[model samples]
Target: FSSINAALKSAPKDDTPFIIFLKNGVYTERLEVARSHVTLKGENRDGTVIGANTAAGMLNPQGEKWGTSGSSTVLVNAPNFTAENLTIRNDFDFPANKKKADTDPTKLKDTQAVALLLAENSDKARFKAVKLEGYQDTLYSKTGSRSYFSDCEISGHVDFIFGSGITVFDNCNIVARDRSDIEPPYGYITAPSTLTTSPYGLIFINSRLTKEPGVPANSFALGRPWHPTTTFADGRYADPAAIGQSVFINTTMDDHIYGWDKMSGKDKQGEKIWFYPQDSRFFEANSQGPGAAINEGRRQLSAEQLKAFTLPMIFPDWAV
Candidate 1:
């Protein structure tokens, strides 16, 4: 039961796999992996836990509260980093408590909580068999390229897996943890800030989308674009200097998921962002659960479209 800061300071600096074995315990602290090419593996996801009790009230080094979109239990700033078989939690129960406070109309506005924050330019990273738990913004898949998540669990309220990056999630579980009268549209799975130039973004392949049992249907949207200004009074698209676009393919959803919607803010002036449900063949071959609905709005892709969207085919070879 060692603090993650201690491990980061004591761990050797080398390209060889720097494996940190974490035991079963609830570590209430914020962690950052600033070094490159490191691996943090636990005995098991259920046994090993890393958590924090900080909320939007807690201030960070920048004097900003740690509950917004990016503050996370673990921030991965370095490239080629990986975590496996562990439970990472933000430990903020605002969403659940909000429902109790206002059962009829859940006012869950600006409730900041996140489990993981992946920074921009970080590449070739992987998260396998891990659990990311929080209330809102559970996982910030920020600007990056060629990242992969396999067999992991992500739970949150709003824009949990949001960001601009060429990333892929294979056989993962996306669980909605909200049980509020928030009525449908309680949260969003992504808030992609994809630039127009960059080809690829977030991709979910053969994944399962679910919610807490008995939660109302249409409780969440696939994602919305991250406009330049928070207010979005001016029509502007996401910053072109940002990163790539976001895409979800071959994923199964529950009734909780809302179909593709437009990006927010005036910045999204007139960008033709790709937000489609590919084809019925792909959905029939890959989708399951209550949320998986086949509709005309769904962006069905042909075999050629699928090949064109492949990360390697779109981005530099080194990214793969």
Candidate 2:
């Protein structure tokens, strides 16, 4: 098989509808797509895989470690980028692929490995029938970007699906891996750093959360607001501008998902999470499962409250 990078070079820069086909095989490479209006279609979801083994600890040209952004296997840098029926994976050893004993201890602890990214100028991105797999910081939906994911399966441990972009996961399988050696609050689904001014950060509509038999019931939480103002290379510094908003509408969660809870950052002008649940823009509506509960943290929005979220109404001036 040929390299994906080599094929992308042949795409026109004029934003025409370019298509790339992938056969059934595991293609291990770090891929980037800068050409707009390009579509990556695979033979099947599991048969076609684009994977890499990179982590935040790897060094880069700036002499800095290839944090979350640089560690991605697929970085969709152009607007209107799309992919379907394939898998994007960042297979870094959580504790298995541990670096040399002399390596930075931080790398061993903060395993911010990523699979796919719609960052660095990506906007209006979309994906369907895709599978994204990773550990921490798996999906980096960047600021000012608007994207959509449907009929997809995503799995991870901590802050698995994160970022500031206005992203929506519709009818997707949201999986939370069970384990505790990596980071605290062991199992959180999302960690959105959406700014205060932004209307929407992350949205989950008619989705389902599932896990393996070993994962305990009611062990995961919906999500927590993140204000990462740190200078750490493992990731970007979140700003107070980020209200960290996330909403779940008519979602079906497994007993593994606990109620909404507070989330904190490791570094970067770390605050005492001065912004509590009440202060942030987090909300949920008509969501139920063994893990679901009616508490102060779970704000049930009424029909009137949900209209703003309807595809036609949300992300105004933007079309799907």
Candidate 3:
């Protein structure tokens, strides 16, 4: 088809797998894959690109704002979606927005530009050799049963890799983009909101953590447990059930990564409460690099405890 969306629109809605091959070129679009069992493959990893610049808080024709989740360049809202050898990017003017917020508060629009969002019901999604690029909220692994990414590159800052899904990033490059111009603690790699019942959230295996130029050492945190505020029986508060879980196994990290950082949330009483990394299930094993270190601030999993973190154990219903 001439366009990616055209191919998706023409695909059969049944359970049969439909593959779409994209030529080597930039296709500027904001598209969603709502049909299950669809595969999107590109001619070349670097040549084929899909990009959009929509951002959260940007007004539409009706003056309704595009929320964070709605600002993704590519969104997958169905099961068994796959993409290979492509680049998905949200090229919103994040730096300009950041500067505007710092200088003129009235000119500020939300800077949460998402490159790819695997939204609810998007289970068993897969990506290989794909690059996801943005500034904040880049790759949102939102509520889904399981997803997999292999040989992929995800670059962003500030909760870039987030959400309440069981995802496995294998042999991928996780880059923290340059934020040296900002204050200390430049960014966080993740903000997982995994439910307590789920044993795994975001798992990284044999991945490499890198940084863009000028990012100072120890300027980024591994992650922060995200407890999305929700309306409970009492009031709108951060769900305590959202006990995020993330782990890294045999991954090399850049020196900019310090351990996890602390985040705050509102309690049932509508009061402020701080959540620390120790309060959640965040661990690492066999991590190597200048950034990897064992201290009181960072936790390491024992050999016995690490046994349960295998991919098979984490995704009992699916296989990658």
Candidate 4:
């Protein structure tokens, strides 16, 4: 009957495999795991949910904007952490904001609400059979995030899965929630801010970008190149130094989604490039959907090249 935070406080500090069992209930609390090699398990993924209502417009105790970092429901800032059979969600409704929009779509929407944060210190983390639910900036695999996610379900709108981490998502369900009103007011599934020096950014192998009923045709985008951190000389929110890389190998996409974001008008007037695909690496292979691009946008890999994208090859250093 103790609070989750209280239970975590009593856990071991070392890498002796600290385990915390959660009962079947929605724990509406803000969780921060700063220790290493921790495991958070739920009795049931659907029955036991950890939820929060923090958004980008939320204020901290210091009265600052929560932003993406502060908006996370569950923030894991440790190494070798793992979570199983659990659900983490940012329970903020963003579609309601979009519906009242007569002005700019972004201005009308509650953007940058995060559900889960696999943060900077969260290297070598593995999550199995986890469900992450949110809108906008949902699951953030930030710097120092060389993690693996398998058998997970992530649902959101906009660039929900955004980050600058080396990650592999295998056999995961990438659910796209339809929301619009900003002209073509659809959502993008990913916004990877990969480093130019890093070879691997984010990979979704044998996953599905599934859509629900009432989702419009060609409404979703697989991924978009993002430059969130480094700004330009004019104080804009983009930089030429950032090179986002993402790939989809043997992934199934529904007709509601697009292969790659054209990023049309991604930037406002007088601003420089925001979603420059030419400078980034966004490739796809063995796609089957109306969303798959047939042009130069979708890059292919040879049999030898495809062999290098394995778990042993990706994380040869880390013990999975």
Candidate 5:
């Protein structure tokens, strides 16, 4: 296969689906899908590798350092993009001195890493059988119209899948990375900064929330509100900025999740953000592991409610 940059630069502009067939190799460069209507298909998720060795604090070619704003191995900014069967990894190794942090409590603050930053607002985007690997902020599914991730593996540490978009993750695996106690609750799984006008936010259906082996099961939270410091301190939270609108329907959970009301930070108490899991078919579903004990706090979605947030309805038709 030719270079991905060459294909991207040479591709034409249109609403039609543009297919980019990636061969099996380690593509060691930062990539950006800035165009709309692009489909990147690989031979297999493991066989096709797109990786970057940059850290969040590292400088890029443009002389700008990466920030907490989702420094990714691959940044998909275009609309109507479908990526299938590929592995996107941020290859930042764990710091050397933190090796004993796993066994000892005092040495936990040494790990630092980041991964795939998916900042796209494209409508009708689909990612099937993809693997996103990183240590922090692995997958940023932010500010999109309607997006779908089916049979995908998203592994990271902090707020890995944060963003405000009408997104659906069906049959996906969310694997939390192993970190130290000093680090914040591996950030949040989702930070839905949804527009106040928008009705839907991030939804995870029939997914499994698991942690890496040896990682404490209760070391994570479902999500948190993305409120500004001023708003957070005053307890004047807004529903639109919070990812709590995120629903994990029929999902298997572990102890890593905050037990129901326990996760609501000071800024999110008694707010309009709905965090209920009653009366849904999945509420009765069996859960195993440490995080599954708190079924009462889950906000299950009904069949009708689930249908209402279908991909077409959540995103605009113009995305195609």
Candidate 6:
């Protein structure tokens, strides 16, 4: 008589906020928040677990592989969604599959297991004391969305926070999972595909970037620019419109951090075009800890320039 989706489906279709209080137990289900102004309050941050194990390349009912976007366990496609004191995790056993992929590439074809996805129109979404756990592509903040995370912990390995949305992580913990067993032993904190027209993308303030025990020093990068492919007049090309921006302010980093990384995308002619970190709007301000350094690869924002990146500018219409 009472289930999470049941409550969601029974809500009256209006602008009224639908508040759902979740108990302290694992509710294993693929969730989709399609209703606007819905608030999910959990009994405890660690006790309330909303988990699933749906990874990319997994066979669906039709036997077709679930692509990156379709693999999200909790997909939010509505506006003004708020979640507090809960843990949303993807239990896909990525490490074992990754090891298998190391031996046989075909064993693990796709490994993008998204824990939460803030899809388009999911604007003004606020998360507090929430833990999002997964491996690669964990939190997908898709295009045209603005989300705020406070006092949250996001743990993952590769491009964990990737998207074109404008997000602010305030006093959050960005944990880099232990992937040292794998070759290269490197992981990216973010892979933003921010639109060129957008002034702000991913903004982290007063946050802490920590890694698992096995992760070695200088093994992680702040982020890499992701230019998502788009259809052009001639063919599919790396959308030149994707000029990503990721900034960190007053954040503490572990020694494993190694500044920013570079990535490449295909041009209109399908040629490899390198995208450097310096070319994008990647900048840091007052970064602390052993990993904090202004190297040739890392850029620092001027005192005056940092003033322009306030919450008001990042979330223009948002009151918070």
State model 3's lDDT: 0.88
Pairs in clash, predicted candidate 2: 195-242, 218-255, 220-258, 228-238, 229-268, 230-268
Residue-by-residue lDDT tens digits, candidate 5, 1-320: 46777887788876566789998888887787788888889888999998877666665678876665535667777777888899988887653434554576544242334555556465666889999887765666555556788999988766667656667788899997776535545545654455545566677778898877756655676764443222555565544344335666667887676632223333355443343323111221333455765444554446777676555665545332
RMSD of 4: 3.1
- What TM-score does structure 4 among the candidates reach? 0.90
Q: Tell me, by lDDT, which candidate is best.
A: 6
lDDT of 3 by residue, 1-320 (tens): 77899999988768899999998999998898889999989998889999988788787677888888888999999999999999999988776666664467555457798999988888998898999988899988766557999999999988999889888999999999886347868899999999898777999999999999978899888899999998877689898899898899999998999899988998887888999999888899999999999988788999999888777877777877
Q: TM-score, each model? A: 0.81, 0.89, 0.95, 0.90, 0.75, 0.96
Off by over 4 Å in 1: 13-16, 61-64, 67-70, 96-109, 230-244, 266-286, 309-320
- Tell me how many clashing residue pairs each candidate has: 18, 6, 0, 0, 9, 0
Global lDDT of each candidate:
0.68, 0.80, 0.88, 0.80, 0.65, 0.89
Candidate 1 vs candidate 2, lDDT winner: 2
In the range 173-203, model 4's lDDT, one tens digit per residue, is: 9988866555444788888887787778889
lDDT by residue (tens digit), candidate 1, 1-320: 35777888787777556778887777787887788887888888978898886566566778876556445778888888888899999887775557554454534445777788777856777888999888767777655545778899988767777766666777898887665555666777776665556566677777888788766778777766564443345644545354324556677787887665554333365645543323111122335667666676555556767777555665555543
TM-score of 1: 0.81
Candidate 2 residue-wise lDDT, 1-320, digit = tens: 37778788877768788888999899888888889888889999989999988888777767877877788999988888889899999988774644436464644544788898888478878888999988777888888788888999898877888888888989999988766453334677888888777788889999998875667776776777777674545555556567788899888888877666675543354435454667777788888676667876677777888889998777566676
Candidate 4 regions with alpha-carbon error over 4 angstroms: 100-110, 180-185, 231-237, 262-270
- For candidate 3, which ten residues in a row score worst on lDDT? 100-109
Clash pairs detected, candidate 5: 79-122, 192-243, 254-291, 255-290, 255-291, 276-299, 277-298, 277-299, 277-300
Ranking by TM-score: 6, 3, 4, 2, 1, 5
lDDT score, candidate 3, position 273? 95
Better of 1 and 4 by lDDT: 4
